Paper text:
Ebola virus (EBOV) is an enveloped, single-stranded, negative-sense RNA virus in the family Filoviridae. Here, we report on the optimization of tamoxifen, an EBOV-glycoprotein (GP) binder that inhibits viral entry, using our Sulfur-Fluoride Exchange (SuFEx) click chemistry-based high-throughput medicinal chemistry (HTMC) strategy. Importantly, the HTMC workflow enabled the discovery of an analog with a 50-fold improved binding affinity compared to tamoxifen.
4S displayed a stronger binding affinity against EBOV-GP, with a K D value of 0.63 µM, compared to 4R with a K D value of 6.4 µM. The electron density for 4R is well defined and the compound binds within the extensive hydrophobic cavity of EBOV-GP, a known target site for other inhibitors. It adopts a similar pose to its analog, toremifene, with conserved interactions involving the three aromatic rings and the dimethylethanamine group of the parent scaffold. Compared to toremifene, 4R occupies a larger portion of the available cavity, with its additional moiety engaging a hydrophobic subpocket, potentially contributing to its improved binding. Unfortunately, we were unable to obtain a structure for 4S, as it renders the crystal unstable, possibly due to conformational changes when the compound is soaked into the crystal, and leads to poor diffraction. Structural analyses of toremifene bound to EBOV-GP have shown that this scaffold binds at the same site at the entrance of the binding pocket by expelling the DFF lid (residues 192–195) and positioning the A ring of the scaffold within this region. We propose that this flexible fragment could be modulating the enantioselectivity of the inhibitors identified in this work.
Numbering used by the authors:
A (entry chain A), D (entry chain A), F (entry chain A): 32 to 188, 211 to 281, 288 to 293, 306 to 311, 472 to 477
B (entry chain B), C (entry chain B), E (entry chain B): 502 to 621
């Protein structure tokens, strides 16, 4: 059955209602809580190339939604808008009443294309996509989510800032996927797994503050050369339209 | 069973968001036409790893996933809201679903305060 | 708390409509294909202001609104049907959610009929 | 928490399940009741100009629906069909399973236009719109509702006639709103707050029974000169196309 | 009441399908991305007419229809999932919704094991 | 109230929770079960002409859905695709989350036309249409269902093969309905109530295995002359484009 978290002897333990002694008192449903916990807290890689490999398309499995009452402030969230090469949408529109995750420091918005060989996009490790107090087994189009898992417990009786980071993708959800961090509609940077959100923000600031944006109508793509842990515990520009940035 | 955290990392601090159901209003703020939008209904709190609660909590949610997913596979409800209510009912049935035999391990009736009244 | 009607007016009479769940059928009327349409499933009754019940009832609904609206703000269910069920569970938990200490004010067990059996 | 109505000492009192003494017996869920009560019973003004000022448009707030098992026969209900000046609908279509209020003596059907500066129309006093055993925080297009409020209780252990009254509105939901009672597609009466439903019905009868309807293809609008309480406790025609009716 | 089968026929054997909620997984089969499709989540069993259970069961479902249809007429929920939960609550209220008078027919408390402890 | 099945004295009895003695023990909700039982088990005629007469169209009654946890392997199921003569669909598309019945030996798929004088198709005997763990009062377009009824109980504390049989209908749901068993898009057999699924399958095999299919582009319709119980207890071809098959 679904496990239940109860504190005994100053330690959190799993014990369902059938395994409770008479000393345990449940005086109202208010003591019962459903909570959502972010995969970030377990040390998973939260960069866009790593996160997307954890998601895949599948058919024949109906989506399911379960609610939770309280969640964790996230550092990294994701907002996907993916189409097939012929232009058809890959992800379903968000059902009525399903809003994005309410607390994200960085929202990684990804627009791109891929084969999308499946009706719905699931989590390959079995985790959930956390929306506003609703957890789904599938990804919804254009809706901010955090990867996470749900717990159920018996209880014993700085402002909010969000920054959007935009990416372009080709061959999404495949063994050969390419990403570009977007500075504007015509200026892009080739993206690597090492690039933290703070590094991307400072890269964007540097490019703007001294004039590396595309001054033509063509697509200017930069590159950060290789010469350049957990979030809670912590240059020269040349053009070779590809380019380089030591 | 005891919860053993088997994760590569554990953020020992929990910066959480939730909603205030009682939400003691200030004037007309409870009226939906005058009240906050969907983005401003949240309260926040911070919780440290006393008793190892946070690290156990992350492990507990990780281990809940398999049973939760199997429950969601077997159900036909599109959105499930009744898991906690059904566990409150199961709590009461385990104790009061049959005849309560006083002084039995499975009957949660303490006659001590009154067993002195007779013998006095 | 007691209910004090603070309204400009109170219609002391309550002409109400509801549905009959048991709805003892007459022949085939229970079959949805043969039964009434959506407009003809209602029964009616009339209730006068005995004990001041009607005027208190109007005031009670007025005062319920703030807590009800705050509950609806905090929930993600589009249509809420389970408020009364959750209050029945809370009723049982308040009395039987822990160990019942006989002769305690919080334990609803009367030993009187049997406490004579021992002393006889 | 949500208040609960229980009878003690021959009087209705508010007392939640945690405040109940052992003398109180709850033997089945049948004793639990959710009821809807009409704002009319509190003495609010139920004429169309007064009722509409209690409703306003707002965005950013998701609608919510709660059910109730029994309601009160209403004298006045409302059915709104409002569009913006460019013709787009202002109110959402009724969701599946939401029907109109089942007992209305007079249904005030209002068709008109307004700016509609908001996604949904709410009750400014925080009351509910009562539909068929469903109470909503928002108004649905073309669906008959009664203004009301919901109570929850622990219980201790003449045919139906409905008349539709049609109105036209301009500048709906604003500080400058005008209404016209409709006699047919081309005959109208300027409406005032004093006009009761019975007065409007007798006005409609009088205009028909002796021939004051528009005998042209133009829009004939009448006016009742100023020289002409609770529902449960109770001429010369000239044309000046405006007109007058002493 | 007793169940009297009044049907023209009764298939005495019940070849049934259901889902395994606990569904003890084999490796990664619990993960929805790797697990069975909607068509392969079912287990099966066979049940013979011991105690006349199958024939009584067919008659019981036939007789449930009228009350079930009248319940569905009176409800506004499009999909009803809570009939069994509401019957579990009604089960507890019938026994524990009031004061339990020991040795009363309506109080399910057996003092026998402890009534010897006093008289010994 | 809704009856409840409990075993007492080695016999199944109807007794609701209010009629239970203290000897009856309910230790968890797992003991509570909702089950679906097929009308076939009661001996009803399961041929297409007989089954369809048990269904009729009606308006003014909202559909309702109730769930059940376990069902019975059926021999006969039905899948309807009916349009009005002008081509408009008669049955609603299946709502989200409502799939077909999971265990059918023969699925009788019927495509045809009829007046369809009603918004929804109900069961005239008050039974239910059983879908995947959901029971409805109405038929959904193109969705496999079994006729059945639901029971609620307190418990005391060979592969799967499915064959589709296709039919054409004219004047569906009327006193004058005609059916044709379909062999291909141009070869048909006039259908009679006596024709069992096994007989139809062997008829289809016989027609194929020696060459009675339409070898033109016209509609070839056969006929089985009259000279040619429960499922759990058990030729010359000439052409007269009508025909005969002794
Ligand atoms: C609860 O936490 C567990 C521990 O963090 C989670 O286990 C994860 O399970 C997924 C699959 O569901 C694994 O991803 C696959 O793993 C294997 C290869 O094993 C990995 O071994 C080490 C472990 O760190 C790693 O360095 C290797 O690169 C491999 O990735 C292959 O099938 C695939 O390549 C794929 O990566 C995770 O690796 C695994 N994590 C760990 C740390 O072992 C478990 O999913 C969580 N439960 C949930 C979310 O419900
Ligand atoms: C429960 O019943 C209460 C008493 O009937 C309801 O109180 C009403 O609250 C609304 C706002 O939610 C008021 O409307 C606004 O009121 C003020 C001005 O105050 C009024 O004062 C007197 C009272 O009669 C009146 O004569 C004046 O003209 C004012 O209207 C301003 O903000 C606005 O103009 C607006 O009108 C109602 O006036 C007020 N009613 C009374 C009688 O005081 C309360 O809403 C109910 N609770 C619900 C429905 O959940
Ligand atoms: C529970 O089982 C009962 C017994 O099987 C079901 O009773 C069936 O009820 C339907 C109507 O709901 C009847 O159909 C109509 O019946 C009458 C004529 O009576 C029939 O009499 C005999 C009975 O076998 C039969 O030979 C005749 O031909 C008649 O059909 C007329 O109104 C219509 O013609 C129509 O056929 C069934 O006949 C009746 N069955 C039996 C065996 O009596 C009952 O519906 C079940 N409850 C459910 C499904 O909820
Ligand atoms: C572990 C954190 C937590 C969470 C939580 C949140 C997010 C993710 C994981 C766990 C929690 C907070 C509020 C909840 O729901 C409130 C709204 N509900 C009416 C619908 C549910 C879970 C929480 C729990 C209970 C009480 C309080 N506060 S405290 O100050 O008393 N400290 C007490 C002293 C002993 O342990 C805590 C905070
Ligand atoms: C206060 C009126 C009322 C209402 C009510 C209705 C509308 C608005 C406000 C209050 C009520 C009636 C029926 C209800 O639900 C029935 C369907 N349910 C199975 C889903 C709920 C509330 C009602 C309540 C209980 C019993 C009866 N009748 S009585 O004759 O026994 N008189 C008893 C003697 C002592 O106080 C009443 C009528
Ligand atoms: C009567 C058949 C039945 C049904 C049934 C199924 C279809 C139609 C009619 C009746 C049944 C089976 C499983 C159910 O739900 C499981 C999933 N749930 C977690 C959501 C519900 C009903 C069933 C019931 C209980 C236990 C077992 N097996 S047994 O081997 O122990 N024999 C025990 C010994 C005493 O009587 C049975 C099978
Ligand atoms: C993706 O490409 C790599 C290249 O090394 C190959 O080994 C792998 O099999 C490919 N994946 C799939 C699913 O074809
Ligand atoms: C950048 O592209 C997006 C997506 O097409 C578009 O909405 C936006 O207006 C563009 N911004 C500028 C400054 O051109
Ligand atoms: C990049 O920097 C510019 C200039 O400060 C700013 O307007 C823009 O929002 C930044 N973009 C991101 C994604 O932070
Ligand atoms: C124009 O763009 C180039 C890259 O193509 C960049 O190196 C250069 O600094 C830009 N010049 C100005 C004047 O902004
Ligand atoms: C509506 O018009 C009146 C005219 O007296 C004015 O006082 C009021 O402010 C206006 N309301 C709004 C919302 O502009
Ligand atoms: C009056 O106008 C309404 C709304 O356009 C229309 O439906 C109705 O047919 C008209 N009636 C007559 C008698 O012209
Ligand atoms: C107005 O009176 C006419 C004539 O009796 C009648 O047909 C019509 O329905 C009345 N209209 C209203 C709104 O009562
Ligand atoms: C024609 O309409 C006028 C108002 O324009 C009205 O006063 C008059 O009585 C009507 N005449 C007839 C003959 O109906
Ligand atoms: C159908 O036709 C038959 C022919 O015998 C007739 O008796 C019956 O009344 C007809 N049914 C209807 C509903 O018209
Ligand atoms: C038979 O007709 C159906 C329905 O139009 C069609 O889908 C199918 O392809 C046809 N089959 C053949 C073999 O022509
Ligand atoms: C009829 O027989 C042919 C030939 O064996 C087979 O392909 C076809 O599926 C059969 N049709 C049915 C409805 O069984
Ligand atoms: C051609 O079809 C006819 C029926 O029209 C059938 O009797 C005959 O056997 C078929 N001939 C061949 C050669 O298949």
């Amino acid at each position: 059955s679904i496990p239940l978290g109860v504190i005994h002897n100053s330690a959190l333990q799993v014990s369902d209602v059938d395994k409770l002694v008479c000393r345990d008192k449940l005086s109202s449903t208010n003591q019962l809580r459903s909570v959502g916990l972010n995969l970030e807290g377990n040390g998973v890689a939260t960069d866009v190339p790593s996160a997307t490999k954890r998601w895949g398309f599948r058919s024949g499995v109906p989506p399911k939604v379960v609610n939770y009452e309280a969640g964790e402030w996230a550092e990294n969230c994701y907002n996907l808008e993916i189409k097939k090469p012929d232009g058809s949408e890959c992800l379903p529109a968000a059902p009525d009443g399903i809003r994005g995750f309410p607390r994200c420091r960085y929202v990684h918005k990804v627009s791109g294309t891929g084969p999308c060989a499946g009706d719905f996009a699931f989590h390959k490790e079995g985790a959930f996509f956390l929306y506003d107090r609703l957890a789904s087994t599938v990804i919804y189009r254009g809706t901010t989510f955090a990867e996470g898992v749900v717990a159920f417990l018996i209880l014993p009786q700085s402002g909010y800032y969000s920054t959007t980071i935009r990416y372009q993708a080709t061959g999404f959800g495949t063994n050969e996927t390419e990403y570009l961090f977007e500075v504007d509609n015509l200026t892009y940077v080739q993206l690597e797994s090492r690039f933290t959100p703070q590094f991307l923000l400072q890269l964007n600031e540097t490019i703007y503050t001294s004039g590396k944006r595309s001054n033509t109508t063509g697509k200017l793509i930069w590159k950060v050369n290789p010469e350049i842990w957990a979030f809670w515990e912590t240059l020269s520009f040349t053009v070779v339209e590809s380019a380089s940035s030591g | 069973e005891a919860i053993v955290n088997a994760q590569p990392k554990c953020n020992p601090n929990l910066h959480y968001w939730t909603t205030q159901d009682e939400g003691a209003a200030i004037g007309l703020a409870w009226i939906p036409y005058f009240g906050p939008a969907a983005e401003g209904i949240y309260i926040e709190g911070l919780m440290h790893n006393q008793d190892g609660l946070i690290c156990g909590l992350r492990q507990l949610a990780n281990e809940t996933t398999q049973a939760l997913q199997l429950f969601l596979r077997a159900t036909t409800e599109l959105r499930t809201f009744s898991i906690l209510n059904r566990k409150a009912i199961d709590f009461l049935l385990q104790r009061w679903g049959g005849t309560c035999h006083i002084l039995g391990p499975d009957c949660c009736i303490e006659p001590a305060d009154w067993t002195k009244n007779i013998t006095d």
